[PDB]
Design a protein around this ligand. Structure first.
Ligand SMILES: [Zn+2]
Length: 655
RNA sequence: AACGAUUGCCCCUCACGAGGGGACAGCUGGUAAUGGG
C-alpha cells in the first residue's frame, strides 16, 4: 500500500574519453538547444510543445530551425528536452517561491511590528526576473548534464581495438560474469615489509608510544574490531592501480566513454544489498540504466532500480493531531520506540529514549534513557564552529574590501559609532542630559528613558497606542529599537549580491557547507542508531520540535550592556536549522516517521504538576515552584514533556 | 540480530609504510534585510 518512490544516488568516476566533451555530438547539439531555449521568451514556450515521438522531434527542429548535428534518437533526446524545459521553468518558479518567502517574512515582521507599536512597512517592492517581452535575466547557464538511456546503458568493458585506454591500463582483462574478488586480504597483518599495504608493528595491539624522532606521545586505536568497515587497498604504482579497476563503456554512434564502477561496488557493499560474491553484470543490473554524466566534474551519478532498493518516502512530516492516529496504527500490533530530541546551544541535541507500548485506549510512555552526544563529537563540533566562523568573518571582510566608493565608509562605521550616535541624537532630539540618568544600566526590562520622557512631558499623543489583540504604553525598548541607523536597502541588495557572488564561487565555502551537512547527518545518525540498539524495536520514530515558529526557546537573558541590543548573528540558529533539516531529510531517505510538535509551551511545564509559571526556568535548571525539584531543564524535563505532548495531539492546556 | 566492503570525498592521527571515524540523496537553489506570548 506504500510503494517505494525514492532511489538513492551512487557516484563513480570517469577514466578516459574519446574526445573532449565539447566535440561530442550529443553534447554540442544539446548545448545549441540550451542556448536557443534559455534565451527564448515565455509566450512562445506556452505555444511550444516538443513532442515525445521522433517525428514530432523532427517537426520541432524544423519549425524553429535549430539543428541536431546528426543525432535524432527516438526517446534518447526526450530526456534532454524535458530537463531543459524543467530548468527553464524552474528559474521562474524558484524566483516566485523566493518572493513568497520574502512576503511571509514581511508579514511576520508586520505582525510583530504593528503589534509592538512601531511604524509598519507598507510593503517591499516586488522582485521579478521575467522581463515584459519574456527574456529572462540571470538566465540558467550551460549545464554539464549528459543523460544516458536504456538503449545505451553501461555494459562491461570488452576489449575493442577502437577503444584505446591510457597507457596505464595496458593489460586489462576482466571476465564480465565472474565474481569480483575481495580487495584487501582477510587478515591485514600478513602483508610483508616490501609489499604495499604493510601495517607497521605499532598499529596492532592498540597502545600508546613515543615516536623516535622527538618522542611525542602518540596513541593508536589499533586494528578496528568492527565487522562492517570499508577496507582500503594499496598498490605499489598507478599501473598496478589500473589493472584492478572496474571499467564499463557507453556506446553511442562510435563515440564512447569509459567509466570506472568501483564507486558502485563500494556503494553496494555498504547497504549489504550486494552479496559478498557478486558478478559485474549482476552489479550493473542492480542499478537503473540511466546514469547522468557530469562533464564539468568527471563524475557519473548512477541511481538504484526501485525493486532492488529504495524505501517509501512520506511526502509530509506529521504534526499536530495526526500523531494520535499514527500511534494508534503503528502500535496496534507492535511496540514502537519514541526518541524525543530537543535542540539547544549549550548541548546541541538532547535525546530521551522511551518505549511506547499499547493497552486498549492508552499509550504508556515508559522512558529508558536520557542521554547527550559523546565527547569526541562535541570536539568535532567545536573545531567546525571555530573553522566556519573564522571563514565567515574573513569572507565578510573581503566582500567589504570591494564595493562602490560611496558605500565603504558608511558600512565601515554604521555599527561602530552606532551606540554613540544613537544616544547623542536621542538626547539632542529630546534634550535629555545623559549624565543625570545612568546609561550603561539598560536591561531587557529597563524603562528609565520612558519615565524621563513623561517627566519632560512634551506630549501624550506620540506614546500611547492600541496594540491589536488593552491600550498600554509599551516599553521604551521599542523606541531604542526604532532608532537604529539601518542603511539604504537599495544598497543592501548591492551588498548582498557582492556577498552572494563571492561565496557562490569561492571553494572554501562549498567545502565547509558540505562538511556541515555531512557532520550534521552524523549527529542525527548516531542518535537514531543508539535509540535502535537500546529499544530493540525496529520502528524508531523521532519526535522533534518545530523551530520555524519557535519564539521563546531562547537564553535566559541578554547582556545588560548598551552594546548588546544589536548583537547581529549572536552565535545561534546555524546548527539548529541544520539539525531540523537533517531530520526532515531523515524522513524521506529511510521512510522514518517524524513528529513535529510546537515547542513554545513544552519546555516550561512538567508532568508532576500542571502549573507552568514562566519564571520557573533559569535556562539550565527547571525549578518547579510547586513540586520542589531540580532537573536539567533540557535533558530531563523538556524531552519528557515533548513525548507527553506527542502521545496526545492536543498541546498542553494553558491556565 | 545480519559477521571487517578495492578508487573516491571529509575529518582525525602518522614513525609516511598507513591507521581510526564519518556522511552517501544527488544536481543547483540555500544563513542575508528591521521577528524576547
Ligand atoms: Zn511541577
Amino acid at each position: 500500500e506504500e510503494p517505494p518512490n525514492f532511489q538513492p544516488p551512487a557516484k563513480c568516476h570517469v577514466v578516459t574519453k574519446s574526445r573532449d566533451f565539447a566535440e561530442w555530438p550529443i553534447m554540442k547539439a544539446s548545448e545549441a538547444i540550451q542556448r536557443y531555449i534559455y534565451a527564448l521568451s515565455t509566450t512562445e514556450r506556452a505555444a511550444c510543445k516538443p513532442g515525445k515521438s521522433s517525428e514530432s522531434h523532427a517537426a520541432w527542429f524544423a519549425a524553429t530551425g535549430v539543428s541536431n548535428h546528426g543525432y535524432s534518437h527516438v526517446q534518447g533526446l526526450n530526456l534532454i528536452f524535458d530537463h531543459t524545459l524543467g530548468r527553464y521553468d524552474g528559474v521562474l518558479k524558484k524566483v516566485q517561491l523566493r518572493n513568497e518567502k520574502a512576503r511571509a517574512r514581511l508579514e511576520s515582521i508586520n505582525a510583530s511590528r504593528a503589534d509592538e507599536g512601531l511604524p509598519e512597512i507598507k510593503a517591499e517592492e516586488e522582485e521579478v526576473a521575467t522581463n515584459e517581452t519574456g527574456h529572462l535575466l540571470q538566465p540558467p547557464g550551460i549545464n554539464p548534464s549528459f543523460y544516458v538511456y536504456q538503449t545505451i546503458s553501461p555494459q562491461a568493458y570488452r576489449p575493442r581495438d577502437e577503444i584505446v585506454l591510457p597507457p596505464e591500463y595496458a593489460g586489462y582483462v576482466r571476465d564480465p560474469n565472474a565474481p569480483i574478488p575481495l580487495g584487501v586480504v582477510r587478515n591485514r597483518c600478513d602483508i610483508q615489509k616490501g609489499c604495499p599495504g604493510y601495517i607497521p608493528e605499532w598499529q596492532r595491539e592498540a597502545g600508546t608510544a613515543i615516536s623516535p624522532k622527538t618522542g611525542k606521545a602518540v596513541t593508536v586505536p589499533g586494528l578496528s574490531p568492527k565487522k562492517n568497515k570499508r577496507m582500503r587497498r594499496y598498490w605499489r604504482s598507478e599501473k598496478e592501480k589500473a589493472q584492478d579497476a572496474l571499467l564499463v563503456t557507453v556506446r553511442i554512434g562510435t563515440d564512447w566513454v569509459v567509466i570506472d564502477v568501483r564507486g558502485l561496488l563500494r556503494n553496494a557493499r555498504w547497504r549489504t544489498i550486494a552479496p559478498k560474491d557478486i558478478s559485474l553484470n549482476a552489479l550493473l543490473d542492480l542499478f537503473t540504466g540511466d546514469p547522468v554524466i557530469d562533464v564539468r566534474r568527471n563524475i557519473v551519478t548512477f541511481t538504484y532500480t526501485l525493486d532492488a532498493c529504495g524505501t517509501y518516502a512520506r511526502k509530509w512530516t506529521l504534526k499536530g493531531k495526526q500523531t494520535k492516529a499514527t500511534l494508534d496504527k503503528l502500535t496496534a500490533t507492535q511496540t514502537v520506540a519514541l526518541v524525543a530530541i530537543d535542540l539547544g546551544q549549550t548541548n546541541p541535541i538532547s535525546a530521551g529514549i522511551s518505549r511506547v507500548t499499547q493497552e486498549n485506549g492508552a499509550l504508556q510512555c515508559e522512558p529508558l534513557d536520557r542521554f547527550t552526544l559523546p565527547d569526541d563529537l562535541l570536539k568535532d563540533i567545536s573545531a567546525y564552529r571555530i573553522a566556519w566562523d573564522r571563514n565567515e568573518e574573513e569572507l565578510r571582510a573581503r566582500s567589504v574590501e570591494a564595493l562602490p566608493e560611496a558605500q565603504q565608509a558608511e558600512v565601515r562605521a554604521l555599527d561602530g559609532v552606532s551606540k554613540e550616535t544613537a544616544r547623542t541624537q536621542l538626547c539632542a532630539d529630546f534634550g535629555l542630559d545623559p549624565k543625570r540618568l545612568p546609561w550603561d544600566k539598560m536591561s531587557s526590562n529597563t524603562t528609565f528613558i520612558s519615565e524621563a520622557l513623561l517627566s519632560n512631558s512634551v506630549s501624550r499623543d506620540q506614546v500611547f497606542f492600541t496594540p491589536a489583540p488593552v491600550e498600554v504604553m509599551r516599553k521604551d525598548r521599542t523606541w531604542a529599537r526604532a532608532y537604529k541607523p539601518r542603511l539604504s536597502v537599495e544598497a543592501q541588495k548591492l551588498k548582498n549580491e557582492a556577498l552572494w557572488a563571492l561565496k557562490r564561487t569561492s571553494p572554501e565555502y562549498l567545502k565547509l557547507s558540505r562538511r556541515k551537512e555531512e557532520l550534521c547527518r552524523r549527529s542525527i545518525n548516531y542518535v537514531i542508531e543508539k535509540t535502535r540498539r537500546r529499544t530493540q524495536c525496529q520502528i524508531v520514530i523521532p519526535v522533534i520540535e518545530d523551530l520555524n515558529v519557535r519564539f521563546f526557546h531562547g537564553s535566559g537573558k541578554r547582556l545588560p550592556g548598551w552594546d548588546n541590543f544589536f548583537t547581529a548573528k549572536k552565535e545561534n540558529r546555524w546548527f539548529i536549522q541544520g539539525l531540523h533539516k537533517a531530520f526532515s531529510d531523515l524522513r524521506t531517505h529511510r521512510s522514518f516517521y517524524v513528529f513535529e510538535v510546537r515547542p513554545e509551551r513544552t519546555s516550561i511545564t512538567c508532568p508532576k504538576c500542571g502549573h507552568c509559571e514562566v519564571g520557573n526556568r533559569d535556562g539550565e535548571a527547571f525549578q518547579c515552584l510547586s513540586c520542589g525539584k531540580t532537573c536539567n531543564a533540557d535533558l530531563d524535563v523538556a524531552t519528557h514533556n515533548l513525548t507527553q505532548v506527542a502521545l496526545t495531539g492536543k498541546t498542553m492546556p494553558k491556565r
